[PDB]
């Protein structure tokens, strides 16, 4: 795995020692090359994971996530170039180093073989994210949002740390391979119930769960564009990966313990999409959409069936790409008009047609138009839920309808109608912005052709 | 082009509007021209019957009862002119309307495709930029101390002065931009 | 109808609006950028018609036929045709034939 890790580390000295003019260029070139290197990991043996060394291993679950992270860094750099132009060279380098440290921590999380190392780096990801939000946010609420995000995640994680140490003391190892191979069943006891809660709750906080999702809207609305990109694309999927890995230990008790979280997610997706129908802030709308999709993923994980897991992985990747692109599209309009209110900017299709096309494609993927990987994941989750219970289809279909409604409603309000007369600062979309939207879209449409890459290990 | 509205509708104006609505709804019901003409002359006679009522209370009560009759007898699907609000073609070409300020963001090659028009546009920009200060001064002078009590705007008092707040009305997009 | 000030304002705006509209008219010349592919007179009547026909059906039909040859052979069951309706009558190989013996009444 060091083929990816060490160049990522070397990105930091290169960024620090590069000339003030060339920081973005050098970062982008080498991050794209690192992603090209990371593309090799997609080749996974069907029976067994790629165990590179004692510390690091990769499977068909970790590889798409690593590729997503490595692809996401250059996109974040392109998006964050514009609003950081006025910043001094040291501050821009510090921002880039926070991004690089975040990518490094995420790669090591997805590849770590030991649950305690996974926890250490998965909690380490908070520090760069918190610094980004609280230092380069543009509103006074960034401090409150950072506090909420940090404290929600830590309150979830600390019991996970205690439980992981207890597992190390009892079973004797936290290596995922050994745990999977030994994996003695749990018993229905209050001690085991609370171990299950401790293991599950940290990831349930990371994957915005209804009632634990309050941090996500504040964080995504208040963060800068790059921070929103990582939060939507990878930081939420950290919870999904953790839950999928950790579900091996808690085999039987999952059936009893899933019902609260299952019902919470199943109702919360409807509630959050209904919230999306009435949101007045574009970033907030996208955030609640992310909450709904992640609730679907939570349902898929809790069901613990092969089709559910495949759909969960597909939805994770597809949603990461779609949400990152949607945040980028919203950020462009925010830079142009300096407000996030949906109603303020109207009829932008006449002013910016290619951006309107990007918005159309992004919304179509968001509403899971086939054969998008979004729909592949969602449909697999729906079929798994139907096997779990035929009555799930009512809630799943209602959620799909509302997702279509709010996606096309955002598209209609922002990009259709009469142009706002008084706004005169709209200017032709830069090649950077269109390039960013294309870099988001083209991989997503391409992955439809070969879907086995993002269908996970159980494929 | 719409005139500034008044605080209230005078009784005469309300009667006129009711007459127009009634004639239009009757035309909607009376599809054929001859029948429409017959019943329209009947309606005109009905208005002329109480045209000269002296008691304003009586005239007001007649207006109220006539409005109730109109609401009962309104056509469920009254005819709407195609470009009128609620019409089939209302706001159809709105997306084609493009504000004039979009021109300033053109690339120089595109602006060189039509030099002469952009020279004329620069002349218009100079004119507006020169006239703005005098327009603001005129608006201050004519404005009452309490503040503008009506949306009406004064005309140009002196030669060489453009009408106050004229730019957008004059440079409003063409109805059929294409 | 309008107040005299209203009439004057409307007239002023009318004059200026007509001036704007007439200034929206282009000149006799629409400047354009300055032979990429030679095309003397090229029979658009039939030659270009044939070129369109070829490029749009003949090339695709060849490509699809080749892909059909590959795909059919590559995997079994790729092409499954409904068993042709063998009405009592000669077959190509089995040459089977049978008659219901009109065991019925003809009159109508």
């Amino acid at each position: 795995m060091l083929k990816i890790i060490i160049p990522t580390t070397m990105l930091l000295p290169m960024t620090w020692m590069s000339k003030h003019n060339m920081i973005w260029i050098n970062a982008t070139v080498h991050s794209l090359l690192i992603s090209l290197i990371s593309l090799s990991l997609l080749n996974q043996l069907g029976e067994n994971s790629l165990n590179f060394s004692l510390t690091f291993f990769s499977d068909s679950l970790s590889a798409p996530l690593l590729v997503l992270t490595t692809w996401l860094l250059p996109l974040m750099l392109m998006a964050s170039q514009s609003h950081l132009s006025k910043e001094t060279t040291t501050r821009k380098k510090l921002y880039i180093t926070m991004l690089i440290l975040l990518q490094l921590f995420l790669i090591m999380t997805f590849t770590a073989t030991e649950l305690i190392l996974f926890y250490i780096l998965f909690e380490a990801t908070l520090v760069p994210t918190l610094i980004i939000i609280t230092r380069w946010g543009n509103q006074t609420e960034r401090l409150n949002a950072g506090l909420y995000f940090l404290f929600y995640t830590l309150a979830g994680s600390l019991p996970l740390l205690v439980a992981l140490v207890y597992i190390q003391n009892t079973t004797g190892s936290l290596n995922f391979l050994i745990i999977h191979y030994w994996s003695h069943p749990l018993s229905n006891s209050w001690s085991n119930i609370f171990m299950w809660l401790a293991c599950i709750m940290a990831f349930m906080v990371k994957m915005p769960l209804y009632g634990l999702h309050l941090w996500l809207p504040k964080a995504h609305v208040e963060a800068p564009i790059a921070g929103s990109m990582v939060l939507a694309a990878v930081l939420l999927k950290l919870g999904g990966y953790g839950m999928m890995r950790i579900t091996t230990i808690l085999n039987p008790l999952t059936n009893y313990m899933a019902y609260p979280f299952l019902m919470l997610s199943m109702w919360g997706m409807i509630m959050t999409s209904s919230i999306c129908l009435r949101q007045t802030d574009l970033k907030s709308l996208i955030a609640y959409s992310s909450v709904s999709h992640m609730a679907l993923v939570i349902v898929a994980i809790m069901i613990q069936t092969p089709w559910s897991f495949m759909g969960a992985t597909a939805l994770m990747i597809a949603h990461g790409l779609t949400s990152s692109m949607l945040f980028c599209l919203a950020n462009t309009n925010y830079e142009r008009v300096h407000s996030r209110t949906m109603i303020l900017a109207r009829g932008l299709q006449t002013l910016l047609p290619l951006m309107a096309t990007w918005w159309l494609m992004a919304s179509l993927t968001n509403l899971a138009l086939p054969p998008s990987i979004n729909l592949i994941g969602e449909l697999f989750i729906i079929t798994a839920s139907f096997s779990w219970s035929n009555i799930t289809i009512i809630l799943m279909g209602m959620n799909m309808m509302i997702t279509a409604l709010y996606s096309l409603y955002m598209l209609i309000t922002t990009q259709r109608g009469k142009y706002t007369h008084h706004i005169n600062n709209i200017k032709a979309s830069f090649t950077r912005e269109n390039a960013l939207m294309a870099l988001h879209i083209l991989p997503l449409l391409l992955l439809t052709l070969n879907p086995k890459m993002i269908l996970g290990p159980l494929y | 082009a719409f005139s500034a509205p008044a605080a209230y509708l005078t009784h005469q104006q309300k009667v006129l509007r009711l007459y127009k609505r009634a004639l239009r709804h009757l035309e909607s019901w009376c599809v054929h021209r001859d029948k429409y003409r017959y019943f329209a002359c009947l309606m005109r006679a009905r208005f002329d019957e109480h045209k000269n009522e002296k008691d304003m209370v009586k005239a007001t009560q007649l207006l109220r009862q006539a409005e109730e009759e109109f609401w009962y007898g309104q056509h469920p699907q009254p005819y709407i002119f195609p470009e009128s609000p609620g019409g089939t073609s209302y706001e159809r070409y709105e997306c084609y309307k493009v504000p004039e300020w979009c021109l300033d963001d053109w690339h120089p090659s595109e602006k060189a495709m039509y030099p002469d028009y952009f020279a004329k546009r620069e002349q218009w920009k100079r004119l507006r930029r020169e006239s703005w200060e005098r327009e603001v001064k005129q608006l201050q002078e004519e404005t009452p101390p309490g503040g503008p009590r009506t949306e009406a705007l004064p005309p140009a008092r002196k030669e060489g002065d453009l009408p106050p707040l004229w730019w957008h009305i004059v440079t409003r997009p063409r109805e059929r931009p294409m | 109808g309008y107040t005299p000030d209203e009439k004057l304002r409307l007239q002023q705006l009318r004059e200026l609006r007509r001036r704007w509209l007439k200034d929206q008219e282009l000149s006799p010349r629409e400047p354009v950028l300055p032979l990429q592919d030679g095309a003397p007179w090229v029979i658009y009547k039939t030659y270009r018609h044939s070129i369109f026909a070829v490029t749009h059906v003949l090339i695709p039909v060849w490509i699809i036929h080749y892909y059909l040859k590959y795909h059919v052979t590559a995997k079994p069951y790729t092409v499954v045709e409904r068993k042709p309706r063998i009405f009592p009558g000669d077959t190509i190989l089995e040459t089977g034939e049978v008659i219901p013996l009109m065991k019925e009444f003809p009159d109508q």
Binding site: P353 | C102, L103, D105, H107, E110, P173 | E25, L26
Partner: peptide, 12 residues
């Protein structure tokens, strides 16, 4: 009698 058609920049 061609009338100018206002449109956003297309070079970019």
């Amino acid at each position: 009698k061609r009338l100018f058609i206002i449109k956003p920049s297309g070079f970019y």
